[PDB]
C-alpha cells in the first residue's frame, strides 16, 4: 500500500488522460494501477542555460505554496494530504538522516510547517566522499528490507 497523493494536473495529464487514450490503446486489456512511472525532467531557464535535471518531491509542493502564498501550514495541509503512514518509520529515518533537504523543521510526530526553503544544495559537500545525494534510501533499500520477504 502507498500513501494518498494529490496527483496534480500534469500528473493527471500524464497518466489519467492516458487512461482515456489507453482505452483507445487497449480495449479489453484492462488496467492494474501503477503510479510509479510518473515521469519528470526539468528544463529550466532560471539561469541563462536551460538545464535538464531531476530533483525531489516536496519543494514542488513548496513551489506551489509559493505561487499561491509564501507558506502552506501543516494543519490544513495535513488535513488535505492524509498519507497512509505505513512506511513512515523508514521515511522518517531517511529524512532525518539525510539533512540534505532544505526543510522547515523535522520533528518526530508532526512537522508543523511544510513551506520548505530555497535551493540550498548542489551535488556534493566534498569530493573524496561526503558525496551522497539525491535521496538514495528508497531506491536500493527496498530489496534490503524485502530480504525477509
Amino acid at each position: 500500500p502507498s500513501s494518498t497523493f494529490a496527483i496534480p494536473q500534469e500528473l493527471e495529464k500524464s497518466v489519467q488522460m492516458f487512461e482515456l487514450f489507453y482505452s483507445q490503446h487497449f480495449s479489453g486489456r484492462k488496467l492494474t494501477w501503477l503510479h510509479y512511472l510518473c515521469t519528470g525532467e526539468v528544463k529550466m531557464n532560471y539561469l541563462g542555460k536551460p538545464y535538464v535535471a531531476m530533483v525531489t518531491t516536496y519543494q514542488m509542493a513548496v513551489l506551489l505554496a509559493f505561487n499561491n502564498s509564501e507558506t502552506v501550514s501543516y494543519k490544513e495541509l495535513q488535513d488535505s494530504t492524509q498519507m497512509n503512514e505505513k512506511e513512515l518509520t523508514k521515511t522518517i529515518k531517511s529524512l532525518l538522516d539525510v539533512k540534505m533537504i532544505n526543510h522547515d523543521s523535522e520533528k518526530e510526530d508532526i512537522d508543523a510547517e511544510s513551506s520548505f526553503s530555497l535551493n540550498m544544495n548542489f551535488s556534493s559537500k566534498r569530493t573524496k566522499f561526503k558525496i551522497t545525494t539525491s535521496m538514495q534510501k528508497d531506491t536500493p533499500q527496498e530489496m534490503e528490507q524485502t530480504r525477509s520477504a
Partner: protein, 102 residues
C-alpha cells in the same frame, strides 16, 4: 441584468490571495448563502462547487468540504440538488481519481 449575483460571487472570487483567503471566504459566505433561498441559493451551490475545483484549493480541503456539503445536502430541494449533482459530476470526472468518495 441577471449577472448581478454571479458578479458578486465572482468579485468574492477575484481575490488573488492564499488558499486560506479564498477557502475561508467561500466557506463562510457560502455557508451563509447556500442556506439561503432562491437564485442566491442556487448560485451559491454552483459557486461552492466551482470554488472546490482548484488544485490551489488542494484536494482534501475540496474532498472534506464536499463531505460537509453532502451533509448539508438535505437542506436543499430536489431539483436544485439534481443540478448540483450534474455540475458536480462535471467537476469530478476531471479528477474522479481524487474524488471517488464524492
Amino acid at each position: 441584468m441577471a449577472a448581478a449575483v454571479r458578479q458578486d460571487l465572482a468579485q468574492l472570487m477575484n481575490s488573488s490571495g492564499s488558499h486560506k483567503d479564498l477557502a475561508g471566504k467561500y466557506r463562510q459566505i457560502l455557508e451563509k448563502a447556500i442556506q439561503l433561498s432562491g437564485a442566491e441559493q442556487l448560485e451559491a451551490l454552483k459557486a461552492f462547487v466551482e470554488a472546490m475545483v482548484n488544485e490551489n484549493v488542494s484536494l482534501v480541503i475540496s474532498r472534506q468540504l464536499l463531505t460537509d456539503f453532502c451533509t448539508h445536502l438535505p437542506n436543499l430541494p430536489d431539483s436544485t440538488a439534481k443540478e448540483i449533482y450534474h455540475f458536480t459530476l462535471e467537476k469530478i470526472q476531471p479528477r474522479v481519481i481524487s474524488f471517488e468518495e464524492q
